[PDB]
Amino acid sequence: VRGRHQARKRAVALLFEAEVRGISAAEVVDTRAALAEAKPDIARLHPYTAAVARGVSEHAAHIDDLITAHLRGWTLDRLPAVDRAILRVSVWELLHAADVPEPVVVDEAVQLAKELSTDDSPGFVNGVLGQVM
Amino acid sequence: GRHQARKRAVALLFEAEVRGISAAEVVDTRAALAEAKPDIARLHPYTAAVARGVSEHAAHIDDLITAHLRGWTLDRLPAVDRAILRVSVWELLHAADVPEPVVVDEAVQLAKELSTDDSPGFVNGVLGQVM
Secondary structure (H helix, E strand, O other): OOOOHHHHHHHHHHHHHHHHHOOOHHHHHHHHHHHHHHOOOOOOOOHHHHHHHHHHHHOHHHHHHHHHHOOOOOOHHHOOHHHHHHHHHHHHHHHHOOOOOHHHHHHHHHHHHHHHOOOOHHHHHHHHHHHHO | OHHHHHHHHHHHHHHHHHHOOOHHHHHHHHHHHHHHOOOOOOOOHHHHHHHHHHHHOHHHHHHHHHHOOOOOOHHHOOHHHHHHHHHHHHHHHHOOOOOHHHHHHHHHHHHHHHOOOOHHHHHHHHHHHHO
8 A cells, every 4th residue: 555545545535425325525525624623633634635536536537538538338327436536536537647657556456346346347447547647 | 304314224235334334433423413513414313223223233234135045155255245234134123113015125225226136135135035
């Protein structure tokens, strides 16, 4: 585990919450920032979680178009919510996190899929992201 | 309004598991914030009851699920499916006002909306044996 693996995993949970509530991930980040200021001992918000989730919101249509273009016939709505969240996090990093090597971005997506999703999800996300990059 | 309350409980359990904190502690800090900040919305009371309930009865809930997984472990399921089964087994045990078949329907529908194509049939099978 890479230094920011947990921050990425918390960003996947924030994107999932946003989709359940029908609100932007940036709005969920604002709430998490308030919680961190209120209870810094038990509810820290990693700065990278906030940057990833805010970033996905700021670039939502472009990220979704790039994913859809590499889904070989599928629509984004057909994916399981956790795989959609992992791909949105990863595509934001490919576009806007120049310090993270592209192979590292994909390997992190593969590790998130292993930890949170199905056993065929790692190969799926590697395939999609390998084409996006 | 309970379907959306159940969806918010699945999301809360997933975030709690990622954070490594009990779902009751997530509820308690989120509820305290909404009492102090007018701009931050309160949780539906049923979301809070479900999430505190799963924490209170975690060992029993996980044992009942594991007894009907046929050798599979609960920790190896997709995280959203583990959260949906914990919410649903809690309702079978402690939400006496909700008919058992309605609990199963809600879980199958949460699986369809939030998880995999195979998840609805999987949760229907496990819960059909738990009830």
